[PDB]
Design a protein around this ligand. Sequence first.
Ligand code: CL
Ligand code: CL
Ligand code: CL
Ligand code: ZN
Ligand code: ZN
Ligand code: ZN
Length: 217
Amino acid sequence: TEDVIKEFMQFKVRMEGSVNGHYFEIEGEGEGKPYEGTQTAKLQVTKGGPLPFAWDILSPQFSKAYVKHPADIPDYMKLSFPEGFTWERSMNFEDGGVVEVQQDSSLQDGTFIYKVKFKGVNFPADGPVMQKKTAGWEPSTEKLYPQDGVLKGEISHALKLKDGGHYTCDFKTVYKAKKPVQLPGNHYVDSKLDITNHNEDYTVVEQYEHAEARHSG
Ligand SMILES: [Cl-]
Ligand SMILES: [Cl-]
Ligand SMILES: [Cl-]
Ligand SMILES: [Zn+2]
Ligand SMILES: [Zn+2]
Ligand SMILES: [Zn+2]
C-alpha cells in the first residue's frame, strides 16, 4: 500500500452531531505516520459551542488508517484505499447513555477525508457526561474479527472520572471496505488516546493517538 498510503499522511474531518438534542458541528485536521500507528488531530467547535457535555465522548470519533500492523495481519483499513471504508459504531454507557456514530473515510488527492455523523441520547442530566466529570479514556484493547463479510470490533472500554473511579462503555464497531478487500483473521489492537491540549471551554482541542495491532495474549 506504499504507493497510495505514504509514510506521512494528513487528514481533514468534519462532524455533525447531537447529544441529548444539543446540535453541534466540529471541523479539524490531523496528520500522522500510518505505518508507525501514530497521529495527532486538532479540532474546533464551529457550531453549538461551547458544548454542554464531556468532550471525551467525541474523541474516539475523530482514523483507522493509522494503526501499525505486523506484516502477517492484513491491514484491511489501509487496503481499502483509495476508495476507502465506512464504520458504524455503538457506544453503550453504564448509566444508559447511548451513542451511535456513522463515518465515511476516503482518500482524495493524497489527503484522507473523514465525514462523521454523531448522535448521543438518554444521558442522565446529572451523569458524568452532561456534568463534564470525565477525565479521559483508559488505554484500550479492541478485539477484531471477521464476520458476515465485514470486520467487527468490540471494546469493554472505560472513561476515567475526575473523582478517580471509572465510567464504563461497551463499544461495538463495524468496519466495511468500499470495495472487496482481504479480511484479516482475529486480532487485537491496543490504542491510547490522549487529549494533549484544549482551551478552557473545549472549543479548540488537540488529540494524540497511538495504535498497534497484534495477535492475542
Ligand atoms: Cl485494526
Ligand atoms: Cl507477528
Ligand atoms: Cl484490520
Ligand atoms: Zn505474527
Ligand atoms: Zn487491523
Ligand atoms: Zn482505571
